[PDB]
Amino acid sequence: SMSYTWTGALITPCAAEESKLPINALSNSLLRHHNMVYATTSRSAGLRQKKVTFDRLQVLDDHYRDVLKEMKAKASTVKAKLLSVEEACKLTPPHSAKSKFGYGAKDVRNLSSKAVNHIHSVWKDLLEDTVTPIDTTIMAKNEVFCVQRKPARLIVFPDLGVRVCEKMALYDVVSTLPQVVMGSSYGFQYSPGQRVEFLVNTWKSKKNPMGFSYDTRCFDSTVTENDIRVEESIYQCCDLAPEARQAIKSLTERLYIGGPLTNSKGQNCGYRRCRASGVLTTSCGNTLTCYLKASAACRAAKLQDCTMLVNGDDLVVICESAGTQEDAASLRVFTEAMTRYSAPPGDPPQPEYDLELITSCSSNVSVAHDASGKRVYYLTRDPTTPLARAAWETARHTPVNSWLGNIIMYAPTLWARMILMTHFFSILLAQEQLEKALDCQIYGACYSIEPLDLPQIIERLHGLSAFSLHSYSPGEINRVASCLRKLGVPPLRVWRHRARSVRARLLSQGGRAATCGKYLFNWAVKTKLKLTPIPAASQLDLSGWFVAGYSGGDIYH
Numbered sequence: 001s002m003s004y005t006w007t008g009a010l011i012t013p014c015a016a017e018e019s020k021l022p023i024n025a026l027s028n029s030l031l032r033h034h035n036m037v038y039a040t041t042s043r044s045a046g047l048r049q050k051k052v053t054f055d056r057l058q059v060l061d062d063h064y065r066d067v068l069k070e071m072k073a074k075a076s077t078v079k080a081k082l083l084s085v086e087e088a089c090k091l092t093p094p095h096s097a098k099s100k101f102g103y104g105a106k107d108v109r110n111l112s113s114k115a116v117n118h119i120h121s122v123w124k125d126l127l128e129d130t131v132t133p134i135d136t137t138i139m140a141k142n143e144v145f146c147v148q149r150k151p152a153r154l155i156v157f158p159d160l161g162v163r164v165c166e167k168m169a170l171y172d173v174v175s176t177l178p179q180v181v182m183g184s185s186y187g188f189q190y191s192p193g194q195r196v197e198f199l200v201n202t203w204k205s206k207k208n209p210m211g212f213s214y215d216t217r218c219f220d221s222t223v224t225e226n227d228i229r230v231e232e233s234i235y236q237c238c239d240l241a242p243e244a245r246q247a248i249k250s251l252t253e254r255l256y257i258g259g260p261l262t263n264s265k266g267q268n269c270g271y272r273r274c275r276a277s278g279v280l281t282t283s284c285g286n287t288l289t290c291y292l293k294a295s296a297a298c299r300a301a302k303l304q305d306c307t308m309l310v311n312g313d314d315l316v317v318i319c320e321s322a323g324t325q326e327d328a329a330s331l332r333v334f335t336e337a338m339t340r341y342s343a344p345p346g347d348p349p350q351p352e353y354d355l356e357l358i359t360s361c362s363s364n365v366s367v368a369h370d371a372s373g374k375r376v377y378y379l380t381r382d383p384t385t386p387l388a389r390a391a392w393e394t395a396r397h398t399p400v401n402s403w404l405g406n407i408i409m410y411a412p413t414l415w416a417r418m419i420l421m422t423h424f425f426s427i428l429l430a431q432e433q434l435e436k437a438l439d440c441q442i443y444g445a446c447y448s449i450e451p452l453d454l455p456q457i458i459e460r461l462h463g464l465s466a467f468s469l470h471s472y473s474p475g476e477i478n479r480v481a482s483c484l485r486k487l488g489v490p491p492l493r494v495w496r497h498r499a500r501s502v503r504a505r506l507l508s509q510g511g512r513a514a515t516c517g518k519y520l521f522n523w524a525v526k527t528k529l530k531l532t533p534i535p536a537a538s539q540l541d542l543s544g545w546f547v548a549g550y551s552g553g554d555i556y557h
């Protein structure tokens with residue numbers, strides 16, 4: 001069937017949409033080539049509609065059913081709990097989209113009777129009706145890129161009342177089931193340090209390692225009704241309260257499988273028969289379905305000593321080489337199988353023989369050296385999109401601070417340390433906003449973070465070496481430098497100079513600010529301070545951080 005059917009009604013915005021990079025007195029300190037940076041708007045949604053709309057065929061074989069059997073056996077060991085309304089309400093982001101039914105995210109968060117009443121009525125209707133399609137909204141995402149333009153990605157989500165109900169029925173399932181079913185292959189269980197460790201240990205466990213990323217073309221659109229019913233059958237294996245079983249069946253039939261699409265103006269835009277990108281089960285559903293199809297395709301292709309790492313639709317496979325000819329043929333069979341399962345590639349996958357050439361979760365492994373001269377592996381990326389987004393956030397407040405998410409996940413990198421840390425701490429100092437909690441997204445869930453807790457956060461996720469890395473690889477250095485030239489970003493020498501001021505300013509203020517100056521900017525000075533384990537790091541409550549993925553899942557921690 002068709003991933004989508006369209007009426008002709010346009011996908012519409014709520015507010016005016018800026019596409020040109022907004023400029024203020026701080027923009028030029030970061031980036032000169034403003035016209036390189038753009039944001040997507042609803043006005044390009046028609047272009048995206050074209051791409052995501054296609055027929056899906058699916059041919060399922062013994063490997064497919066075999067792997068599914070294994071997954072269900074593992075799922076059967078999972079006991080999951082129903083969340084109370086209030087419990088589910090407290091998981092709602094403060095900024096989440098308001099209900100069509102007279103209340104908003106803040107009414108949910110502070111448990112207004114109006115919100116709670118409606119949520120109970122929604123839950124009741126779920127138990128009683130397992131057939132009536134549930135309305136969704138389709139919106140266009142506003143996201144920031146550098147020019148090579150990408151059309152806007154789309155988001156499809158049910159009403160707020162429904163979203164709290166999903167949490168009630170499925171928050172525990174989607175948080176706990178994936179690791180049990182997929183074990184070490186489940187990517188969202190790892191911090192950056194743990195993930196790079198897993199990638200490096202896996203690479204080193206092969207006699208002759210070969211690896212590849214598999215880019216499915218528009219994954220969500222490839223997801224069929226079969227896939228969604230299959231994922232429900234996996235959920236149903238869990239030990240669940242009777243109400244949870246019924247609500248899960250109901251949400252599957254009425255929401256997850258498909259439904260009508262409505263724009264922000266309330267006009268019918270068409271019908272969805274594929275994965276909605278804005279439901280609680282988006283990340284878990286995609287991860288299970290990706291792992292099932294890939295695991296079975298590995299068996300079809302007869303990959304040797306094959307290890308998978310899966311983050312939703314993001315997949316990397318590391319195995320034993322049979323030489324370049326056989327590896328290319330193997331990957332073709334793997335791709336043929338994935339295609340039969342309804343997950344054809346975007347870019348065809350290529351076998352890689354150097355771990356550092358493999359991009360997965362938008363990141364590649366690279367090497368640097370710590371204080372002792374010891375080798376340290378870390379995850380990095382082309383800093384173009386991070387810097388384009390940082391530029392936008394220099395002039396505009398956004399509900400999610402990409403810059404902060406990037407500093408947290410890419411702390412050990414040359415570009416996050418030299419540029420992002422220097423620029424944004426300078427801004428926080430000038431506004432006297434060091435103390436102010438900032439929102440960011442980690443594995444799709446929303447967190448309120450205090451920038452002053454960064455040293456502890458970084459110690460916990462990357463280790464102390466994150467504060468002492470040097471002697472970066474020529475390849476990493478060249479990619480960073482070439483990016484700075486492209487965007488018109490001041491050279492790293494300018495950033496070192498600026499950093500020395502930021503550092504001294506932070507040290508002058510004492511307390512947690514001085515700690516930031518000491519740890520985050522030790523790289524900026526010749527005569528370094530001694531960086532010992534931070535006392536406060538040991539008390540940090542980072543439970544919930546690297547448990548599961550929640551992209552589009554409307555989750556706040």
Ligand SMILES: CS(=O)(=O)Nc1ccc2c(c1)S(=O)(=O)NC(C1=C(O)[C@@H]3CCC[C@@H]3N(Cc3ccc(F)cc3)C1=O)=N2
Nearest residue numbers: 192195283286311312313314361405409442443444549551
């Ligand atoms: C839509 S889906 O099917 O869930 N696919 C998906 C793939 C990959 C996904 C996500 C979703 S996500 O929206 O949960 N966030 C992330 C993610 C993050 O949340 C953080 C935040 C900033 C980027 C960072 N990265 C890159 C990354 C990942 C691991 C790592 F150790 C270092 C860096 C990520 O991979 N990756």
